[PDB]
Design a protein around this ligand. Structure first.
Ligand SMILES: Nc1ncnc2c1ncn2[C@@H]1O[C@H](COP(=O)(O)OP(=O)(O)NP(=O)(O)O)[C@@H](O)[C@H]1O
Ligand SMILES: [Mg+2]
Ligand SMILES: [Mg+2]
Lengths: 333, 9
C-alpha cells in the first residue's frame, strides 16, 4: 500500500480542493473544543442531515501571529493524506473573517478525556493505541511529512475503538531539517527546545512521551511553569513508575533518548527498530492496519450527533465582519 | 488535568 500511497499524495497536493461549501449550509449545534486561533464545533449539514466537525480560524490572528504558512500547510496536507487512522477532510471554505475546515465527526471523544477519567491504560491497552500511531508515523514519513503535535488531546477514539488523528496545524513537508519552535511543552523533543534543527526524529520522541502518559497516567516531564519542563526534558534523566514492564522501560529508554544518533526511528533500520521491539512481540501489524482486531475499549454512542464524550464549553455564536480581512494572504486556501 | 494547549513561541 505504501508503494501506491506516494503518488496519490502528490496528486492531491498539487491540485487541492478549495471552496467546496459555505457557512449557510451548516447548522451549528455544540462546540467540541477551543484552541488559540478559533474553535471546533459539531455541525449538521442541512440538506443531508450528516454531522461534521467544523474547525474555525480567525484570519486576522493568523496573519498577526505569523501563522499563515502553518495554516496553509494544515489544509493542504490533511486534504492530501489518506490513512485509516487520519481524520478525513470533507469541506473547506472561508468568508470575510474566518477560515473553515469541515472534518468527519468522531463522536468517541479525545483520548485525553478517557485517559483522565480512567487514570491510566493497561499495557496491552496502551500497546493497541501505540501500534496505530507507529503505523501512521511510518505512513507520514514515507511522504516526507512531519507531525509536530502528538498528544492525547489530538487523538480521537472512534466508534470502532480505533484512533483518529486530527489537528494538522504543525504538519509540514520536511525534506531535511526544519527549525520552527512549535508543539506542546510536555511533548517537545530536546532538539526543538535548544533551537538545534530537527528532523522526523521528534515524532518518535513524542511517541515515547505518549506511551509513558498512557501506561502511567501522567507525562514523564511536567511542572508548573513550562521553563521547568524544558529543564527536565533536556536533562537526560527519566524515572519510570515501578509497575512498568522491563520490556516497556527498554522501549521508552530508546524513544526518550536525548542523543538522536541513538534514538529509535532515527537509526539505520528506521521503524523496524520499533515494530520489532520485544514490547511489540504480540502485535499483528497487518491486522491493526486492516482494523481487524477487537478494540479493548469502545466508547458509548447514544446516537448520531451525540456530544456526550466531549466536555462542555462556553457556547459563542459565530460572527463575521462585513469587511473582508486579509483577502490576499489566503488566496491558496 | 487540563487540556494542554500547543505552543508557538
Ligand atoms: N474531526 C473531529 N471530530 C471530533 N472532534 C474533533 C474533531 N477535530 C477536532 N475535534 C475536537 O476539537 C478539539 C480542537 O482541537 P484542535 O484541532 O487541535 O484545535 P487546535 O486549535 O489545534 N488546539 P491545539 O492542539 O492547542 O493547537 C480537539 O481537541 C477535539 O476535542
Ligand atoms: Mg489540539
Ligand atoms: Mg493545533
Amino acid at each position: 500500500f505504501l508503494a501506491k500511497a506516494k503518488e496519490d499524495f502528490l496528486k492531491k497536493w498539487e491540485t487541492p480542493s478549495q471552496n467546496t461549501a459555505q457557512l449557510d449550509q451548516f447548522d451549528r449545534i455544540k462546540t467540541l473544543g477551543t484552541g488559540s486561533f478559533g474553535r471546533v464545533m459539531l455541525v449538521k449539514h442541512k440538506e443531508s442531515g450528516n454531522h461534521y466537525a467544523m474547525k474555525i480560524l480567525d484570519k486576522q490572528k493568523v496573519v498577526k501571529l505569523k501563522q499563515i504558512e502553518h495554516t496553509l500547510n494544515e489544509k493542504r496536507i490533511l486534504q492530501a493524506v489518506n490513512f485509516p487512522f487520519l481524520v478525513k477532510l470533507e469541506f473547506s471554505f472561508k468568508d470575510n473573517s474566518n477560515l473553515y475546515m469541515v472534518m468527519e465527526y468522531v463522536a468517541g471523544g479525545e483520548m485525553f478525556s478517557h485517559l483522565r477519567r480512567i487514570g491510566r491504560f493497561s499495557e496491552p491497552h496502551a500497546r493497541f493505541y501505540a501500534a496505530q500511531i507507529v503505523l501512521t508515523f511510518e505512513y507520514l514519513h514515507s511522504l516526507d511529512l512531519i507531525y509536530r503535535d502528538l498528544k492525547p488531546e489530538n487523538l480521537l477514539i472512534d466508534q470502532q475503538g480505533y484512533i483518529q488523528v486530527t489537528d494538522f496545524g504543525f504538519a509540514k513537508r520536511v525534506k531535511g531539517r526544519t527549525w520552527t519552535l512549535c508543539g506542546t511543552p510536555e511533548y517537545l523533543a530536546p532538539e526543538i527546545i535548544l533551537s538545534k534543527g530537527y528532523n522526523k526524529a521528534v515524532d518518535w520522541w513524542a511517541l515515547g512521551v505518549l506511551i509513558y502518559e498512557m501506561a502511567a497516567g501522567y507525562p514523564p516531564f511536567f511542572a508548573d511553569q513550562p521553563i521547568q519542563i524544558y529543564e527536565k526534558i533536556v536533562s537526560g534523566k527519566v524515572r519510570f513508575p515501578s509497575h512498568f514492564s522491563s520490556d516497556l522501560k527498554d522501549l521508552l529508554r530508546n524513544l526518550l533518548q536525548v542523543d538522536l544518533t541513538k534514538r529509535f526511528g532515527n537509526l539505520k533500520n528506521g521503524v523496524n527498530d520499533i515494530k520489532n521491539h520485544k514490547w511489540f512481540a504480540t502485535t499483528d501489524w497487518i491486522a491493526i492496519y486492516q482494523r481487524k482486531v477487537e478494540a479493548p475499549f469502545i466508547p458509548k454512542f447514544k446516537g448520531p450527533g451525540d456530544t456526550s464524550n466531549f466536555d462542555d464549553y462556553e457556547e459563542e455564536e459565530i460572527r463575521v465582519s462585513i469587511n473582508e480581512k486579509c483577502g490576499k494572504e489566503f488566496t491558496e486556501f | 488535568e487540563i487540556r494542554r494547549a500547543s505552543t508557538i513561541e
